[PDB]
Amino acid sequence: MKVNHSISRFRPASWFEKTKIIPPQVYIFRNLEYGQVLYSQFPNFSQTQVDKLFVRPNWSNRKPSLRRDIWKCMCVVNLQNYKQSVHLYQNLCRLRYLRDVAQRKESDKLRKKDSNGHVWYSGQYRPTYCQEAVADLRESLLKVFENAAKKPSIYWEDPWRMGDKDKHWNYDVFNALGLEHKLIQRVGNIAREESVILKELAKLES
């Protein structure tokens, strides 16, 4: 039998070039249950990806369930090259690690706290994690473009999810690139026919 799929490993640029399943892009997934975010190189994901990201879980940041319904696509970010997309993905993973393990106290300080000193929640949904992921995405992209034709773009689930187009998202580097903040077309069941929509998006920029 064949055990591994495309998702089963980390895939570098060379592998993507060989295959060309999807264009150069990174997918981001909200967790409807907890508000946690999940980055991935592909429009699907497995337990391996979850394990990779959610390495130090606690009561506040519990390791999420892999149940398909609670995961929903926050953001699909397209880039100029496969290698660039891979680098972005690595940066996001690094940032996550820093927030969870290495520079955790700083991250905690940055967050919104409620009375009784806990990171603000409603149920087990914590809206800070999503915000951090957007901020982290912005950071990683910026780093990628510092390190550094198709105009790159970030297809959003929802236009509301931007902090502010003035305060953030108006760096000089992004402007030079032509970073188009588009949104995914909601002319159908967005949750149920999500995979189809993602495929259609992938087709569009190729």
Partner 1 sequence: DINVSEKIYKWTKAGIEQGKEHFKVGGNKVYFPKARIILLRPNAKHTPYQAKFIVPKSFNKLDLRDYLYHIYGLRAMNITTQLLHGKFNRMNLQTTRFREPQIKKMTIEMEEPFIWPEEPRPDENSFWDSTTPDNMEKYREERLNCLGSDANKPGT
Partner 2 sequence: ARTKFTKPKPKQPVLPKDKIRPPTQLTHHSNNLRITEPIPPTTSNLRCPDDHPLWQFFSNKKFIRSADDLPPSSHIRPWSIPELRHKSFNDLHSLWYNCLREQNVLARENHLL
Partner 3 sequence: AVPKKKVSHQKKRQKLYGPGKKQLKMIHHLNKCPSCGHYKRANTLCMYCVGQISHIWKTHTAKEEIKPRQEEELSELDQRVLYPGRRDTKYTKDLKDKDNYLERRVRTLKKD
Partner RNA sequence: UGCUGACAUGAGUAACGAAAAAAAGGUAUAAACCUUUUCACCUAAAACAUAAGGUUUAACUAUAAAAGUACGGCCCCUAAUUAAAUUAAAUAUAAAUAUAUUUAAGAUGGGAUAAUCUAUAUUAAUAUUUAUCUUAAAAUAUAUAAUUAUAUUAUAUAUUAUAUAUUUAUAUAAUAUAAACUAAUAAAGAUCAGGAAAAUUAAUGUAUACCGUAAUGUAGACCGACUCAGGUAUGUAAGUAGAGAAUAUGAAGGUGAAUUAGAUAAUUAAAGGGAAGGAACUCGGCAAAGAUAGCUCAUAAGUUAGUCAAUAAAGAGUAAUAAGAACAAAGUUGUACAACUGUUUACU
Partner RNA sequence: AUAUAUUUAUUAAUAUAUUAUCUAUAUUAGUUUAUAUUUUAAUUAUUAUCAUAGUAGAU
Where on the chain is the footprint of partner 3 (CB under 8 A)? 109-113, 120, 122, 127, 131, 163
- Residue 112 is a binding residue for RNA (CB under 7 A): no
The single-letter DSSP state of residue 150 is: P
Between CA 203 and CA 205 the distance in angstroms is 6
CB 165 within 8 A of CB 181: yes
Which part of the chain contacts partner 2 (CB under 8 A), choosing from 9-17, 44-52, 65-73, 191-199?
9-17
Q: Which is nearer to RNA, 162 or 202 (by Cβ)? A: 202
CB 62 within 8 A of CB 170: no
The single-letter DSSP state of residue 34 is: T
- Residue 52 is a binding residue for RNA (CB under 7 A): yes
Which part of the chain contacts partner 1 (CB under 8 A), choosing from 17-25, 123-131, 134-142, 164-172?
123-131
With CB cut-offs between 5 and 8 Å by kind, which of RNA, partner 2, partner 3, none does residue 143 bind?
partner 2
Which part of the chain contacts partner 2 (CB under 8 A), choosing from 17-25, 36-44, 157-165, 195-203?
157-165
CB 84 within 8 A of CB 144: yes
- Residue 160 is a binding residue for partner 2 (CB under 8 A): yes
The sign of the torsion formed by the CA atoms of 154, 159, 162, 165 equals positive
Between CA 190 and CA 159 the distance in angstroms is 15
Which part of the chain contacts RNA (CB under 7 A), choosing from 127-135, 144-152, 174-182, 186-194?
186-194
- Residue 186 is a binding residue for partner 1 (CB under 8 A): yes
Report the 10 Å Cβ neighbour count for 116.
Answer: 5
Between CA 95 and CA 137 the distance in angstroms is 9
CB of 183 to RNA, least distance (A): 19
Between CA 84 and CA 141 the distance in angstroms is 9
Site string for partner 2, 89-118 (x = CB under 8 A): -xx-xxx--xx---x--xx--xx-------
- Residue 139 is a binding residue for partner 2 (CB under 8 A): yes
- Residue 115 is a binding residue for partner 1 (CB under 8 A): no
